[PDB]
């Protein structure tokens, strides 16, 4: 299952100044970028056009170009409309796309955040506020829902265009999406908060895809004190992760870090301290 996400970030500093920047993800791989200073959407993969013809892509891009300008003015007008309830500066984020399931099934979404809080979605045939949203948004929703043309366009984009486009992306991008990159590991140590304690660190870098197993071990005994950090990105669309273990000074000898990853083909990495 792959989630396609179009992420829009719009800053409105005051009545005059604004910028909108977008990035597009298929799973954890970036497929598009659209900078405020660019007239056109940028491909970040050879296969970012999917299976769309040039005419189909140009038409789709045109729709987005009209959208970006129209969106900017509409926010500025909505601020005037709700004045002086809401004032600049204002951040608006959109998360839109579709989740792809087997048997050509899919679910589409369009979520909107105002000042970093999820307040609005498109659902069915209309815009709606979500639980917890402030009541003043009811007027913007009324105004947005008066626009039958936008409603019809969004319905088509979410229901039809998104899944069709993404099906083609998955085909065109197969070899990148299914790439295997091997982890490399290395060990290190630092003093912890405790007085006479050490903190061993197993560094694991360069692996793709994300799923990985990393455990400190004394022989066949998995050390339960093992603490995985967060998954951190490398610049080359691989992943980095470190697993720590708080131990007593002197007890380092005997410990080893074992790494299991799909890319290694059963040949686990074992590093002895």
């Amino acid at each position: 299952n792959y989630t396609f996400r179009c992420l829009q970030m719009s800053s409105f500093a005051n009545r005059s100044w604004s910028r909108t920047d977008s990035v597009v993800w298929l799973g954890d791989l970036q497929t598009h970028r659209w900078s405020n200073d660019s007239a056109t959407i940028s491909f970040t993969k050879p296969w970012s056009q999917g299976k769309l013809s040039n005419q189909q892509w140009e038409k789709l891009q045109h729709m987005f170009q009209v959208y970006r300008v129209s969106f900017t003015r509409d926010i500025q007008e909505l601020v005037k409309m709700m004045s002086p309830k809401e004032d600049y500066p204002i951040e608006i984020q959109l998360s839109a796309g579709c989740e792809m399931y087997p048997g050509n099934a899919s679910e589409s979404f369009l979520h909107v955040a105002f000042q970093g809080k999820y307040v609005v979605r498109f659902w069915g045939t209309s815009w709606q506020t979500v639980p917890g949203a402030p009541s003043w948004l009811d007027l913007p929703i009324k105004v947005l829902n008066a626009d039958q043309g936008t409603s019809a366009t969004v319905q088509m984009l979410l229901n039809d265009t998104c899944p069709l486009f993404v099906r083609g992306l998955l085909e065109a991008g197969k070899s990148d999406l299914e790439k295997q990159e091997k982890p490399v590991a290395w060990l290190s140590s630092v003093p912890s908060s405790a007085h006479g304690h050490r903190q061993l660190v197993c560094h694991v870098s360069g692996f793709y895809p994300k799923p990985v197993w990393v455990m400190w071990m004394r022989g066949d005994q998995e050390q339960q004190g093992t603490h995985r950090g967060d998954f951190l990105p490398n610049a080359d669309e691989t992943w980095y992760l470190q697993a720590t273990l708080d131990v007593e000074a002197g007890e380092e000898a005997g410990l080893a870090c074992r790494v299991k990853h799909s890319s290694l083909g059963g040949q686990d990495i074992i590093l002895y301290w």
Partner: T-cell receptor, first 114, second 111 residues
Framework: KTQVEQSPQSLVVRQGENCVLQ??????????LRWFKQDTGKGLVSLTV?????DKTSNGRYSATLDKDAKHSTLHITATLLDDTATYIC?????????????FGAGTQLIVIP | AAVTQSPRNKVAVTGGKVTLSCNQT?????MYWYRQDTGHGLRLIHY???????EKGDIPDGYKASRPSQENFSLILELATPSQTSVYFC??????????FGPGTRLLVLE
């Protein structure tokens, strides 16, 4: 100069003759286009509103077309009467809501000779 | 959905104060002031999204707008000039795109 241009600027027809009025625009986006009739020193009377990519409407002796790809509309008047003497104004609305701005043409002056 | 304007016709002198009024009982949030000059389409001067709201249009200079209530939207020429000789139209509407126009006001500013 402007985003909405009408042609001809003016015309004179004899009673019973048909005529065609043109509106060309550069407005983006183009949600809808309306034709108004304005009698001398009077107000704006809506004749028709066109909304579809390729639209056709009618209202008695008035009929209109819209081609959003060419950004072009025509108003046809069949069998002109003295009371058709007026200015005809093309307006493009850039939104399907109150967030829209209206973009007005400068009008075509029609005189019908009785 | 009806809209009225007062006065319907006004002769004023340069430097004098002129107030053009527009009333609608449609309970429309939104009201709009335009002027119509020969050789031009109607041009937006000021508009309002509700009582207390006034917003500049395309040609606001020399005009002040006032929205004291939902019903009334006024255009104020503080220091009238001959360039403000025109026909002025007010419109109202709700969240929909339709603007419902008043019958117009003719203003002549003499020297």
């Amino acid at each position: 100069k402007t985003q909405v241009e009408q042609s001809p600027q003016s015309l004179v027809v004899r009673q019973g003759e048909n005529c065609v009025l043109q509106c060309n625009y550069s407005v983006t986006p183009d949600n809808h286009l309306r034709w108004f009739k304005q009698d001398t020193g009077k107000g704006l009377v809506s004749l028709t509103v066109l909304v579809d990519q390729k639209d056709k409407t009618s209202n008695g002796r008035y009929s209109a077309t819209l081609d959003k790809d060419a950004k072009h509309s025509t108003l046809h008047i069949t069998a002109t009467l003295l009371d058709d003497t007026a200015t005809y104004i093309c307006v493009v609305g850039d939104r399907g809501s109150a967030l829209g701005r209206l973009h007005f043409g400068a009008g075509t002056q029609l005189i019908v000779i009785p | 959905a009806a809209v009225t304007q007062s006065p319907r016709n006004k002769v004023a002198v340069t430097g004098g104060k002129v107030t053009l009024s527009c009333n609608q009982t449609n309970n429309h949030n939104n009201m709009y002031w335009y002027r119509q000059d020969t050789g031009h389409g109607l041009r937006l001067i000021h508009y309002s999204y509700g009582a207390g709201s006034t917003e500049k249009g395309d040609i606001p200079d020399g005009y002040k707008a006032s929205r004291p209530s939902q019903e009334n939207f006024s255009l104020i020429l503080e220091l009238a000039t001959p360039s403000q000789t025109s026909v002025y139209f007010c419109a109202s509407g709700d969240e929909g795109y339709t603007q419902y126009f008043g019958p117009g006001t003719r203003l002549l500013v003499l020297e």
